[PDB]
Design a protein around this ligand. Structure first.
Ligand SMILES: [Zn+2]
Ligand SMILES: [Zn+2]
Lengths: 209, 248, 47, 186, 51, 107
DNA sequence: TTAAGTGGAGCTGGATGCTCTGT
DNA sequence: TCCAGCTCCACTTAA
RNA sequence: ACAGAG
């Protein structure tokens, strides 16, 4: 191979940039439009190219809310990541005082490591992604509508317009791929823009629960 | 053109080791005994598969009676040898007779859940383009092979679409698939009926069936639940839980 | 074991199919008629 | 295990695969010309088809009764033991044996000529055993060992056992029911 | 009468096809180690096959 | 492959002795020393090749001074030989001609 | 070495159309 | 006649 | 419990 392996490290990186951009992190125009033949320049073929610590991202600051709110993306090399490698990434994350990270596992994650991500801390939140999910940006798939994470001042209008409580809205799971993509948590509301058969649009709403 | 279709077809359609080997042989020598597999590299070169002897070493060593990487050698670009080891669990070292029927059925290339794939042809005068039909049950893998346009592949199965693309893509698949089945038998239904059915199936975030199990997750009322199926169990549970039933 | 396989069949694929069944009886100590009848006896449901 | 395995466009030479395969197993430790290492050529292990016993070496169609009798007459004058199956009743009467039209067997008859065996053109073979002619055909081709042995209890408690020879071919004799019935239909 | 023949055939031990190490074990299982008043095999090895 | 003991006719197993590998019975002393190379070939079924060569594949068997095809009497045709089953089959010969205003398939 | 969390396999209990018309 | 939950048991990780 | 009818 080597032609195929670099293709993944370009497509995965490209999707993570669009994922970070859609979450509202500061992403530059040359990161999103990074071409395959341009990817070959900073990191080349597999002997020169390094997977565990060359392709890591940390430049992503939450430029809307605050430049100190920052997030990692990590690319482990072992297909099943143990707690040891998690603890390695956690203490590096502890030193930098960053509170969010993405871990991009290649085949899976061992069960005792998965349990750690639930309870390591509420103030140190890490999201597992399999790379096989990142080879295709699901927000550009033809069956997936536009999702828009609503602000609290807009949720308060939705519930006022219909005179609802929150627990009467339809539900969306936190384990949903598109919920994971936007990184939303319980009690956020997503606006969903379904396309009509005509030129028009229908607007619907869901509650994360 | 078809030359590109057959490449990526060969990246999803399962091929077994026995399908690309011109023979497999046991060899007993005075100093050692082993099983040997010679790959038919002519047939590899035609079927456009990206496998060789060094890759077949990686197809083996996974889920095959804990065979060791050391025990598998790649003495030439066409040959592999699997030195048998004692299973040391409900078996005799003579486990070569297990491998001689099992080693061909290991998967060297492709997606394990795909039974077959076929190329399909359009007949319109304006164009000619080839779509690939996959009879199998791993949507995520087919969305991620090099050379499949992952943004426009679809599935019949609502459970696969839910697990891969979320509840709102599963909701559209219930609409598309019911409407497809109705149109083929010449029935017609206004879209607003199949729309409401799919929105009832997905409003709690999971695709719930119209079975007794799905209805027990949707409906709170004991007497509604007890007037369909499992009429005894729902009434004893309401007694245990002390549930009060809205007569609404 | 030979006279069993003679009855079942002497084609190579018929022998290959029956092969894993010889390899079961040789794991147990069943080599004799009396041993085999003892094995069946310990499986019979008593009426 | 490194997963990103590399491949190349070059075409494998035919002899290069052949000679690589050759070097993998042509090595031999046959130098031990010793007793233990030696092996008895007449006690090889039995490959399962008994006609095909030889799996290791120092390096079929079916016969018909006209051909069997021709080989033992012209090509080889050596005597050979056939084994033949007769019908349940021969066309005789038990001579003075105190009966009822009971079955007649070879144990009831007396020594002498009993009949004649005819080979016809086109391979038909008949056993003319009286006025009637019985048909003779080849039986199942056995290929296990068969031994024809005498047992004689020459004394009250002891005696002699003697092996007279091996048996190779089986003949089946049957009545020609079409000819018996074409005499007098019913 | 009720014809039931039995034969006993001798198998040699100096030929290479006899694993004497295993032959000593099987003979020791069948016969008690030194009794030899009644014994299937006279020698310390399996001498005979019965048909 | 199944091999059976000349003595008792139980099934043999392969084991290792002090000088050679042996076929050995489990129930009698009989052993057979593997003195020389012994083999058993399976020859399994390969894939179909029918829809693999159609549509301008990467064939290569053409050579200088090759014969013309019998209908067009021009060398504008490819020819190849392949095994259709396992390599103990005698190879079959097949050829296809593609010319202007002329499509045919021949054997 | 073993405590433990999670895979895979067998057991169990549930369900299978609407009515009249007679013996 | 077909199909979801519940429980038993091997099978790696991890200390 | 069986047969009918639509
Ligand atoms: Zn034996
Ligand atoms: Zn032509």
């Amino acid at each position: 191979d080597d032609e195929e392996e670099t293709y993944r490290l370009w497509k995965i990186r490209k999707t993570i940039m669009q994922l970070c951009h859609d979450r509202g992190y500061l992403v530059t125009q040359d990161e999103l439009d990074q071409t395959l033949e341009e990817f070959k320049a900073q990191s080349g073929d597999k002997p020169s190219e390094g997977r565990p610590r060359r392709t890591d991202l940390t430049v992503l600051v939450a430029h809307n809310d605050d430049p100190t709110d920052q997030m990692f993306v990590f690319f482990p090399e072992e297909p099943k990541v143990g707690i040891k490698t998690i603890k390695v990434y956690c203490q590096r994350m502890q030193e930098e005082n960053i509170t969010r990270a993405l871990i991009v596992v290649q085949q899976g994650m061992t069960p005792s490591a998965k349990q750690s991500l639930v309870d390591m801390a509420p103030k140190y939140i890490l999201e597992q992604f399999l790379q096989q999910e990142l080879l295709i940006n699901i927000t550009e798939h033809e069956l997936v509508p536009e999702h828009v994470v609503m602000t609290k001042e807009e949720v308060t209008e939705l519930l006022a317009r219909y005179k609802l409580r929150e627990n009467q809205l339809p539900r969306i799971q936190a384990g949903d791929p598109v919920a994971r993509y936007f990184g939303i948590k319980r009690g956020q509301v997503v606006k969903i823009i379904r396309p009509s058969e005509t030129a028009g649009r229908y607007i619907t709403y869901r509650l994360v629960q | 053109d078809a030359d590109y279709a057959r490449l990526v077809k060969g990246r999803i359609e399962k091929t077994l080791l026995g399908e690309i080997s011109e023979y497999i042989e046991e060899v007993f020598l005075p100093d050692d005994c082993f099983i040997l597999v010679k790959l038919s590299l002519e047939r590899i070169r035609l079927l456009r598969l990206e496998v060789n002897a060094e890759t077949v070493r990686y197809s083996i060593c996974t889920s095959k009676l804990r065979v060791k990487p050391g025990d598998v050698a790649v003495h030439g670009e066409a040959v592999v040898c699997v030195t048998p080891r004692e299973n040391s669990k409900s078996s005799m070292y003579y486990v070569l007779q297990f491998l001689k029927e099992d080693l061909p059925k290991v998967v060297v290339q492709g997606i394990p859940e795909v039974s077959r794939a076929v190329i399909h042809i359009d007949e319109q005068s304006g164009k000619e383009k080839y779509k690939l039909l996959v009879e199998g049950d791993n949507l995520r893998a087919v969305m991620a092979t090099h050379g499949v346009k992952g943004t426009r592949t679809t599935s019949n199965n609502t459970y696969e679409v839910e697990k891969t693309l979320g509840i709102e893509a599963a909701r559209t698949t219930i609409i598309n698939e019911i409407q497809y089945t109705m149109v083929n038998h010449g029935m017609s239904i206004d879209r607003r009926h199949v729309m409401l059915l799919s929105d009832l199936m997905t409003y709690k975030g999971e695709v719930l069936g119209i079975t007794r199990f799905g209805l027990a997750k949707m409906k709170e009322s004991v007497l509604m639940l007890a007037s369909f199926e499992k009429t005894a169990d729902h009434l004893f549970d309401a007694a245990y839980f002390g549930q009060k039933d809205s007569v609404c | 074991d030979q006279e069993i396989v003679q009855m079942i069949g002497t084609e190579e694929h018929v022998m290959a199919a029956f092969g894993p069944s010889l390899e079961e009886c040789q794991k147990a100590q069943i080599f004799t008629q009396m041993q085999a009848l003892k094995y069946i006896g310990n499986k019979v449901r008593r009426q | 295990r490194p997963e990103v395995i590399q491949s190349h466009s070059i075409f494998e030479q035919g002899p290069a695969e052949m000679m690589k395969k050759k070097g993998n197993w042509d090595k031999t430790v046959d130098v031990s010309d010793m007793g233990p290492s030696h092996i008895i050529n007449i006690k090889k292990e039995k490959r399962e088809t008994d006609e095909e016993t030889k799996q290791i070496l120092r390096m079929l169609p079916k016969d018909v009764s006209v051909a069997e009798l021709l080989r033992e007459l012209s090509l080889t004058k050596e005597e050979e033991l056939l084994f033949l199956q007769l019908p349940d009743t021969l066309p005789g009467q038990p001579p003075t044996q105190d009966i009822a039209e009971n079955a007649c067997t070879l144990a009831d008859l007396t020594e002498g000529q009993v009949g004649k065996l005819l080979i016809r053109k086109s391979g038909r073979v008949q056993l003319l055993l009286g006025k009637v002619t019985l048909d003779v055909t080849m039986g199942t081709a056995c290929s296990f060992l068969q031994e024809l042995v005498s047992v004689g209890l020459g004394d009250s408690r002891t005696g002699e056992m003697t092996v007279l020879g091996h048996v190779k071919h089986k003949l089946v004799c049957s009545p020609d029911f079409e000819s018996l019935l074409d005499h007098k239909h019913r | 009468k009720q014809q039931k023949v039995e034969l006993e055939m001798a198998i040699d031990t100096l030929n290479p096809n006899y694993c004497r190490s295993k032959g000593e074990q099987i003979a020791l299982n069948v016969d008690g180690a030194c009794a030899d008043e009644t014994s299937t095999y006279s020698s310390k090895l399996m001498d005979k096959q019965t048909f | 492959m199944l091999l059976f003991c000349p003595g008792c006719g139980n099934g043999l197993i392969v084991e290792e002795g002090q000088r050679c590998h042996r076929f050995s019975c489990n129930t009698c002393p009989y052993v057979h020393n593997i003195t020389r190379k012994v083999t058993n070939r399976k020859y399994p079924k390969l894939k179909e090749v029918d829809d693999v060569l159609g549509g301008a594949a990467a064939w290569e068997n053409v050579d200088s001074t090759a014969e013309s095809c019998p209908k067009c009497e021009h060398p504008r045709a490819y020819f190849m030989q392949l095994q259709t089953r396992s390599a103990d089959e005698p190879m079959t010969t097949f050829y296809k001609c593609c010319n202007a205003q002329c499509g045919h398939r021949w054997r």
